[model samples]
Target: TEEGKLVIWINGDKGYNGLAEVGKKFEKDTGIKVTVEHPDKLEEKFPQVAATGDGPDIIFWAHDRFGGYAQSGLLAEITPAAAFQDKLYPFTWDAVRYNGKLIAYPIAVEALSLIYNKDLLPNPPKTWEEIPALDKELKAKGKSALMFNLQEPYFTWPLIAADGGYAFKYAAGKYDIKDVGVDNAGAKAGLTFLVDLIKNKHMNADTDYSIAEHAFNHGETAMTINGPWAWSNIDTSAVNYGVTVLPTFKGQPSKPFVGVLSAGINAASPNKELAKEFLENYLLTDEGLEAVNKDKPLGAVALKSYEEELVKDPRVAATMENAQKGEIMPNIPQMSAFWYAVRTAVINAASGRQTVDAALAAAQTNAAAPMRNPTDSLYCCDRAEDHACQNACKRILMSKKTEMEIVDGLIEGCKTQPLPQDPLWQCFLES
Candidate 1:
């Protein structure tokens, strides 16, 4: 009797509606009674559900959030037995893979790209250098050149990453946490470019997603960065619209964080095997793809046979081009610190409360401070030993405590000294 019941939790009102359609089809085909629960508080409810060890059979969540769950030992590592690895996109597969374990099956993938008003920008600029000049031209004509959510880190990080900068470096296929390159030359150059554009009144940062999208559709702003999720609200007929990969600085292309929606099996479920079978057979089929395409319209992760047919629509094609270059957003436990600090840095700079350099430096300091140690250099037994000895030596050298503590002390020391007023912060404040 328990095998006949299948329960799932999906996030957001729009996502819940999409899942309901799929759930109904699943029930009609398998005779299994599927119950769909749309939680307004999926984040808060998930841990509670996990704690009871009585959660639903499956969960739908963004892949970037899985890093924390896996690190906390709350997620079950899905095996090849759950679903074939070949059925999904490489980015989707890689997004859910952490510490050498596959943890989820992705349902959808999204990427950000430049969307422009056809009326204002008949041809979009192909290089970042042209952006400032283009903005000036638009402003001279009494129109806003670009629209962006000034408060969102998502909008700013792409520009930084595009310019050969990164929040954390990935080398030899592993993340190097010690690297704080956001304050590096490439990042500073990118930030300076954005600041100049804003100061010249060519861009508007106070605009939110709704305002930006509306402004673009209504031909108010020439261009903006957004994802497939905005399709519903966009007025395609009001202007000739076009989409392209975000422009690059010095030929280095912009890489947006890929947002993935994945299905994870509940470890405590009694019918785990049966649930896996249903998911592999029914949920990854042509029927499932069609239902998801009809409802979501973002992009599917699975390599269903019908995607070519679905994407034939020109509107969907524009979104697909951007999704192809999507980078997996980091899901590490420290991502909370990374996100908050980045947001604070970018928003403060955009709002004129701080300079871009000052904001980034503060963000780097805050992010790196937690990993420092003080007494690390005093450790002994350093002369080449066995693998274990080398490991110990490395750990002592990079001791999290010593590095972060030293950084904190340095920032405190700076606070005691006289510093000039940051011109960028002053500008934002005056604006």
Candidate 2:
């Protein structure tokens, strides 16, 4: 919003940390002052500021936010240069688009892969059936064969997606919010397999990201499902490890979530043309990519030409290879509910409090609950599955209530619906 200045927002310590230097060069090249900010909680806070027309000229964030921001009218459409089009991987463009319109410029990408200790487990399993045998053999030596945060939906998504499960369906260039697949047989099977891993003592129920990573770094675990970011924290001296594509289940390949780091222009930006110039002339160039890649290397640089250099790092190559088979995360705001409900389901199933089938079914219900159309209070309230709530909803709507009032009434009804036992209502109230 400032005169002759282009402001950019980013999360602290992005993979490529040399962006400040790139900003300096942009200032030098075009007399436009480039102010780079690493604000805390940029994702959550940026929207509030952007809605007020006081946000940065540019925002560097994961592609997952593109759908929400673009749909909210916070982002401007970006048409990359024709010459620049061929320099990047074709699929990278898909990540930064919303409803067939490009809203951001892809910078880098990553996906989860099987990162394993080569010394302890020379041959990582190519299929889930092989894990039990491997786990038994590794346990004899006092080590776990494979480990990942059992409660993390991000790490567990590959298994859930292995047999055709998905949070939402995407087709014909748009996402079908009504078609949530988390409760389908494919997702149930995946969760069942994960729960069995814990039940069979192949993986520890108590293990989380930090503990699993610590054990893996100290040569105490054989393999983990992690992204390229984990490579920088690994104690390479203690554990000689390598990366490979995630194994299959029931002959279906593990489809991990692929994330694209990209930059988008703020729709309210006063200096739209200058912002585009800054991105096209300076940030998206080979020279710019090389400069950023110098400090902290990205898992895979978005440019096809530059990726050839990055792929020399074996781990980076594996991530890029695995990403080919991965699915771009659904970027819609509805995805927010998926995280909360799925995490609850994952923990419930992994801890044996609920069967995998029941947990996932509850997850699907809860995940879809928050999206009930607010404009139709009666219909929205009917989803509560309680006659008392339906009656209350009717009373409220008949009283000429607003959408927020309808939401509030349903939420209050959820409060009375038992705690801990009714995760659906608990999640609805919380969500």
Candidate 3:
């Protein structure tokens, strides 16, 4: 109260351009000193600090962890203003709402689509059945068919979702964590699709993320699955690429997950009503929206009225069609478990190390395993080091995949598998 301040936690320069510029507008209007603290990690840091009641007045970050933070009592349950429904895309509301409560205001929306080289294929494959024929043409030309981080979960999530495979079964207004559905028949059908892709050497385990990225960037591949983040990195001059929705399977279109960068009000904020007003009223304007997307224009702004403004920019327009068609990623706490669990199933099934049933079953087991005291929770899910820990943690939790011979990739991996010492936390388990 000394400065009559409204404090907020935002991601640092790593994500580029702080909300400070956006918050400046709010400060100018309300005379509330808006202090934006840009931290390297928002999820792990925000909940703990907020629990102590000294947290920021508001938090600016992705909504992926909003469920866990809210459940932990770190967030305020602020209902949206009546105009909320008209302001943003429908799916974006799904991103910010938790247990039917509006928890955050989404800033930028994200979704992935299939990126194809026009030079390689005149028309991208529209259906699963059409892929083999197009792939044949691609392969004969000394280029790979489809390429992406097949081992990673996000890009491949569309594949699992196509057959109605969901991480946790949601019904009756709650997610039943005990009823893990990764191993369900629908999930097995999804895994089978990836298994076939690898068995024919269409994809390989050795072709991890970087390898696939380099291959695609260098024009060695005809098509790959990705988001707008990589579009700038692509050599657009040599690669006359076009973005399109992923092909449909069994008549169901593959639905990519939608991720949103959102602003949340802290439960302990001294000025809850003002914080809410700042997000709901002030930031929704064009001047405020421009500041947030200036340095790094993330996908379309969540507001429908901004479509004319957002789509005029080629970068934001490219992913709009896919964003409209995507499934809003669940922001529940169990989602952290889902990422680690499904990724292993992908690698094992893709590499012939596990049958579709076994891989999916093992995935369920791993997802249910409590992620206790892993050092590298700091890294995002895209990296290989965390994948090692995920797989190691999985085998330690459940090694039911008898199809592959179990060997040195266990607790020993906690040492050799690219993970070194961190800033001294107590050592964890052995089983």
Candidate 4:
């Protein structure tokens, strides 16, 4: 058993890098042997790993995924003190709890905000209606005023949630999973506004996150609705970037949903008590948080001390403000519906094939029905619903000469291999 050893599961890139520093100290102080594994695609790999009962003692991942994991019964009930909740932002609770117990522990919070190019618009719009005027101004120069991943509902949901449309309703300390609001009149109004933006000159239905990011950074697009995950990619010198709370739709403010990156003990772990103690006491402590921030600056952390440390920087200060205005994303199994149905509705409406009402109705209908088959992973290529991912899967299948995954490694600079680097190959490696 290695007595008190801990197998830590983390993201392939920098997940182990940042946590490794503190993990070493944790082992020394607690006499625990800490070993970390970096699966190429941790989120996709985690469920399969945990299901086989060979999972790590502690798993690190975005809190949004916790609901699916919880629905699958993958987590151990956490035993944090009542005061533990006080240190974190209030939104932190939405993702970490299931029926009032801590199912996962909050570490960092991320939410979408209006990231605009300062040079393009010295004064950005405060409401969705104003965007048309801005678009008119930009179109004269053959430019679009606003853009984002039009077909992906996660980025688009700030508008939907802003108008009182929600994936699931949260009331009186628990989520009302039965109350999905995708087809609601309020949300539909918001969804229509976004679709109209696409219908007009402000955005393109074809743009995904990468396209929007490249266009925005290259000065081809004036603005994009993105988050911190994309902040580092912008050529800062080329584009004088600006950040703000998402603008309002109609008269209501755009209410973005906050997502957390969290840590939790797996239900199948042999070292549950040890993992629980480490998460609640040592890993989440001020000292531990400080060590983690040193390695990978938590954009916004749960601890007051860490948050106070975070706001001292301008980047995190802006993110903190947006987080204050946003709600935590409901970490429910139904999120799968929101990801697929809502996105499908957006694409249909944006592409003009379906009217707004028809698209909204279809989204509601799809969400209410059984989730599309397998429901294994959201890596576009893993989901049958994603055509682009479907084509990529086909390309990999054809090039790799098998329906299965192959090993990942360095090779010729030619870079000709079909790489299933993220979703499936990592699973194959671990298998």
Candidate 5:
């Protein structure tokens, strides 16, 4: 409640307490009191609170969440000095940018990689073709090899993206949502390799995240596809694990999605200058990251100088290496459609409901489907149960109302249109 204090809203207990320690140092150095709060449902509450010009000085979360906020003028542009920028990896900057403008300061980065049992397999294979023989060797020892969730698009992404597959095309330094590459030849070939393993009985078809995680942690599996966040659940003493880049497919390196943890300043904050200084000097620095992870691991740091620190944790080192070869997840709202499509496709492909090619093609078609225009009153109101509700929705759309006005008017004036079960609600809600 201090008038001059800088407030931060963070999620997760370890991250909250970890950065709270760093805040103490920043407070002492800058003579500005700092407070860190662990808020429940920070993501859901941020937009509502920030829109009213009342929120914390800083918001901490993944860089992807800030794109809509930045576009809505809720986040301030983060223009760090070029010298400071030079000290970090170039890819970290890309994750924090919105339309080529920096919207946040990257704190840590993560990407999926092959985590193997060093005791069972001293050196890991470089290709997916080499895994089946390893699987045969492990079967004799009452252990399995290379398990990953088949139904999860995130885990399965490396297989599809190893060659030239992609969810969206990137050109002119931004994603082109209209161009989807999920059904291309490269993606089909990559997925074919995975489907062969299943069809040939070289890998189990029923493995899921829980099943794979359980098998790996219980010493029943030799290797699994995972990321830094999975480290906490791993029993290091039992696994004797080593993290490395995912196996190649079709002579190309496997590509996983790179995710970034970032810190953004609130545009409504009165202490924008102090917030930027706190980020560049206190949160994003090498020493600052060390303090931030003093109580809990913050995953691989985003700074160039962090390589020395990475050597202390091999898992973190592998994730940093894996991230360099991975594509950053598109931060645009349109990506919601992409994820939904991919997930549906993966489930259909694995469940024998559709062929890999058909499933992937469905993903491309569904993801590339034209989004419902907010101004299309006819399309939106078509889901209304009664004529009165339809008339009300039409009025709201034709008036060129603000987002808030449309939402508020629809909820109050339409009886059945705004309900969660209503298609009318979904039409307006879809990204």
Candidate 6:
């Protein structure tokens, strides 16, 4: 009887539509009833549902959120489920595992890279240092160097990770919560690179995602650091666009955070065995992966069979190349803190409130504030349980704000906030 009932929740409209296609296929093949639920606000819904012990029987979520959920005991560690582990990608499977427990089944993995207008930029810069000079050359030809969303977190990780800096670190198979590498020397260098680009007018603060796409399409900008999601909207003229690995710095390539979404069984569901059965038998099959690949051209983790097809397509090929070199975004419970602090630090560094070092230091402090004693707990699910659950709930209830709202708030905050005395801050201010 339990085998007949299965429900899965996915975030956002695109994700909902994508998962629904696979769900339909699963239902047709197994005679099991599969229901797809699309939640309007995942950040809110995930915690509320998990807290009430009524989470979906199976749900799709980015691996970055895995650590926190596992820490809170909200997600079932599926790694021990040997049947599930055997079929997934090693990297994808590794991403969903927290403290040795596999919490979910991998679906898709995404990484960022440079997308350039071949007509305008015959050759994309090979490294970050080359960007400023390239920017000047492009400007002389009446084009911008790069287009970016200065305010979006998803767009910032590659730059930070490329310089050997990390928002958080995993060691000995657990996350080091107190090790906020964002303020590390390498990280500062990376942030400065970006700041200089903005200061020298190589990049524009006014450009958002949509505008960047429009600008690149019209040949107004030569290149942009973006992911596969924008492929559909890009303008591919006769010259077409070229995709390549994101630029590097100091001998290290920018390691874009790989966003992997996966499905996990709900521990509390009465249909747990049935849900697991469906997932193992029907969902992991090549047929299921094909359905997923049909929906989203990028990041189908289990669909290795489609790799050849992807390589044939230039855009997807570029994405795959980048994914190979990318680091899986940490799924540790403390990731939420790292994201919050890293964004604040970068924005502050950009807005002139603090020097790169000061901003990163401040961010590190803020990120570690919510974690409990010894810092080792940062890497362990047991210690993460209490902290992750509380923080996740808090974030869920906070008034949701759009990027514009956050940007406006940051601007207002900068105007009212006092400036830092750090030399880096002073130089930034002077610039």
* Top-TM-score structure, candidate number: 2
C-alpha root-mean-square deviation, candidate 4? 13.0
Instruction: Supply the TM-score for candidate 4.
Output: 0.73
lDDT of 2 by residue, 121-164 (tens): 88889998789889999999998898898767888989998997
| Candidates ranked, most accurate by TM-score first | 2, 6, 1, 5, 4, 3
Q: To one decimal, what is the Cα RMSD in angstroms of model 3 from the true structure? A: 13.1
Estimate candidate 3's alpha-carbon lDDT, on a 0 to 1 scale: 0.68
Worst 10 residues of 4 by lDDT: 406-415
lDDT tens digits, residue span 1-431, model 6: 14467888876423455557766766777666778787766745776787676777887777787666656555655633564565556777777766767778776677777988787878888888888888888789888888877776668778877767777677886667767788787778888888878788887655676788777777788888887656655633333788888888877878778888777776556777666766666666666655555554444455455454555776767777887787778776677877888878778777767888888888879887764312222122222224443333222322244435533432343222233533322332343
Clashes of each: 12, 0, 0, 0, 0, 7
Using Cα atoms with residue i matched to residue i, what is each candidate's TM-score against the true structure? Answer: 0.74, 0.77, 0.69, 0.73, 0.73, 0.76
lDDT of 1 by residue, 311-407 (tens): 6666557556655554677766656577778888877776678998898898887766564333223222222223454333333333334545534
Off by over 4 Å in 2: 4-7, 11-13, 31-41, 52-54, 235-238, 370-431
Clashing pairs in 5: none
Q: What TM-score does prediction 6 earn? A: 0.76
The true-versus-predicted C-alpha distance at residue 232 of model 4, in Å, is 3.2
Q: In candidate 3, what are the lDDT values of residues 1-431, reduced to their tens digit?
A: 22267887776521234357766777787787677777656666776676445678888766777876665455677777666767777777778887678878877777777888888776888876566666677788888878888766888877778778877777986777777878877677766877777676677765666677677778888888876556655744367887787888778778677778788887657788888777778776666676665544556778777666778865466576776665667798777778878988888777777878888888888777764332223121113245565445433323322322222333355443333342111123221
**TM-score winner, 2 or 6:** 2
Task: Itemize residue pairs with steric clashes in candidate 6.
Answer: 67-331, 67-332, 67-333, 68-333, 71-385, 78-102, 79-102
